[PDB]
């Protein structure tokens, strides 16, 4: 019942038999003979369709579906992390990084500027994942309470990012929502490549809670099985090189869970510059936007998460592929009113190429044609 | 201006000029020309004085203060700890324990049974001492969050003992209260000589919080920096076999902390059985009555407290000395409408000698002519 990975080389036996043509011209709506994975890994593969061309047709595909957009800001909760990806800046042995932890005061202080000052409704929470039972039921039981408390804000959609999570971690952050709250776990499994994920996750064993792959990768089957709906898996971009094969898993991944009656988000976030102890593989726009298109493609009730990991002008050219936009900053209690948001290489995960404030990003969008649901530009008679 | 340890020969030699009878003739609120550290050491050394004799003035000294008796009942939010107290179940090396963590659900629910159940208007919230800075924080957030749940729910009176505090751990805990509001915070040194001590609680620097006896003694003195004012210091007495050292050193610090303005009560709990890995000195009654009553002599405005850890006999015969009557269960969330609570062996703290329901405890002592404030007897036209 739970997720399997499937066999690569199973998938690329059935894309050899896909007519990548005839996918191209099937109608909205309408659904390919082979499966997701081996479809995505053939329009993938077949290089006499354009990038461009690829990107033209996932928008089309995704054309239909409404809310065309939404949002959600990242909040950091703390930046202490018991794990060691070398990749992250927030890695246990980064002895460097000045940690801090924000209180009861400081969240709801930060729910608020989001709120009033961003006119944000979207907020995501994230924290570190720990390694022993009881900082872990802890940490569960304050990002419950996070999560409850944006809701009776008035927030409409609430992530939540916060490492793997067990049955009864699951129960502790339960007893603080519904079962029909709009509450998403994110789970990215990072690199979906066994071999891959031990050498940036570490190996098994010894204390590096994340180094557990498979604790981490059903993750969402425990969500679902305690009767929740919203799961957002994703993809590291950057750490293992053959981006055919984590396609492959992630597109197997999502199907998996849309089997299994889940709304789920897809995130292929593309590295950025932290304080690491293993460096990483630059992936160039191209092979990008070409990976973002076959997965939107495919999945096209899927929403992608584009985030300001990403520069202006690379948002310019791939808005058009997301389902969700989620500016914001990954260092803890960053905003504050009026001013940009605070992204201090001392305490940050890592740095982010678009530091501009949530409003104006989304107020932009909305001036060249695209309404964000979730956002409530605070401008005008709605404003005080 | 921190508390600092008395030098005990030198209260030795203070001791020797004190007319103990003299003392004993002192009207009520009347005070010893001499320190109380030195007067208490005389009145224990001066065996012409009968121990039933000093019981009886003590109770009389402490005869005016009104309410005679207020009560909390305790409840264990867990029974993780990080820490290896050798007299102690909960242990980290104890790997026989079962462990609990109460959730939201489970601790107002708890709150909930004590209210209306058992009638009581105080509670303690208790956890273990844990390691990493994280981890202090977390369970800081969530005893402050139950804290003031507890308070909302229409609790006067609310204790908490979750191991020593450095002042930022306060400040999480804080943003739940008010500087006036009804919070006690609980820190017992265990044993003031520092040698016994580590042989209990373990040598500093390796990982085991509570090893650190200086974070630990300063703590109350950090809750009075932050604004607060009530404080319960304690004395584990079967730790260490000088019975004379502790008296001194805990009246010593009851009264740096009365400088300092502060309410504390004052706590002497004798030990129960246990899961040890070192076995302790068992006290006889009458040199803990001794001790009872020459703490409470001497300390007339700060309540000592008892509890279940002590039989129904005994209580019977030192109730009159104590402020405080507490009674319950060391066991994570035990309490049950109508049933005794649970004091499992597999899962609890230690092994109580009273497990009577505290509103029948409560209920026999008002019956037998002591009213005891924070206790609201569920009967007659008070019961739903
Ligand atoms: N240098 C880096 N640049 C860009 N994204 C990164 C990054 N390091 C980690 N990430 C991504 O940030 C995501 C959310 S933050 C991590 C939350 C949680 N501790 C967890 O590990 O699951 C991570 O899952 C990872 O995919
Ligand atoms: N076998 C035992 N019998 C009786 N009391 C004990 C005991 N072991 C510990 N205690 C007492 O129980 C008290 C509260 S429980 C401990 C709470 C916190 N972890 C802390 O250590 O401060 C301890 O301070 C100790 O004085
Ligand atoms: N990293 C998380 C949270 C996040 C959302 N938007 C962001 C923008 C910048 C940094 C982090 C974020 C995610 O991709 O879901
Ligand atoms: N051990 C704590 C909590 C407590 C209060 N009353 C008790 C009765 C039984 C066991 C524990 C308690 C204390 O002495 O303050
Ligand atoms: S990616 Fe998550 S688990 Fe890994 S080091 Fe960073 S914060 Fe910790
Ligand atoms: S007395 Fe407190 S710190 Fe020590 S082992 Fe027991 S619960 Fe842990
Ligand atoms: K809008
Ligand atoms: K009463």
Not at 279 to 290: I, M, N, S
Request: charge should be negative.
């Amino acid at each position: 019942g739970d997720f399997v990975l499937p066999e690569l080389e199973d998938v690329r036996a059935e894309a050899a038999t896909v007519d990548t043509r005839a996918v191209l011209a099937l109608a909205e709506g309408e659904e390919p003979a082979e499966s997701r994975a081996a479809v995505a890994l053939a329009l993938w593969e077949d290089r006499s369709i354009g990038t461009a061309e690829l990107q033209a047709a996932a928008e089309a595909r995704c054309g239909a579906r409404r809310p065309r957009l939404h949002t959600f800001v990242p909040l950091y909760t703390t930046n202490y992390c018991d794990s060691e990806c070398k990749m992250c800046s927030m890695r246990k042995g980064n002895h460097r990084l000045d940690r801090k932890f924000s209180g009861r005061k400081e969240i709801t202080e930060q729910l608020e500027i989001l709120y009033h000052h961003e006119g944000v409704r979207g907020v995501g929470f994230l924290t570190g994942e720990y390694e022993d039972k009881h900082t872990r039921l802890a940490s569960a039981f304050r990002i419950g309470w996070a999560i409850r408390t944006a809701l009776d804000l008035g927030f409409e959609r609430v992530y939540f990012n916060i490492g793997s999570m067990e049955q009864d971690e699951i129960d502790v952050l339960g007893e603080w929502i519904g079962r029909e709250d709009p509450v998403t776990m994110c789970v990215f499994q990072e690199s979906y490549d066994r071999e891959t994920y031990r050498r940036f996750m570490g190996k098994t064993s010894v204390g590096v809670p994340k180094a557990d792959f498979d604790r981490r990768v059903v993750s969402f089957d425990r969500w679902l099985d305690a009767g929740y709906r919203y799961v957002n898996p994703g993809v590291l971009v950057g750490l293992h090189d053959d981006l055919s094969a984590e396609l492959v898993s992630l597109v197997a991944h999502g199907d998996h869970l849309r089997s299994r009656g889940a709304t789920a988000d897809l995130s292929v976030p593309r590295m950025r510059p932290a304080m690491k102890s293993r460096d990483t593989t630059r992936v160039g726009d191209d092979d990008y936007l070409r990976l973002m298109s076959v997965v939107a493609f495919t999945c096209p009730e899927q929403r992608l998460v584009l985030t300001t990991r990403e520069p202006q002008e690379f948002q310019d050219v791939a808005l058009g592929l997301a389902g969700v936009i989620s500016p914001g900053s990954p260092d803890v209690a960053p905003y504050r009113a009026g001013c940009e948001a605070r992204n201090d290489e001392k305490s940050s995960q890592f740095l982010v190429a678009d530091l501009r404030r949530p409003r104006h990003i989304l107020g932009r969008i909305e001036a060249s044609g695209t309404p964000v649901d979730h956002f409530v530009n605070p401008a005008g008679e709605a404003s005080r």
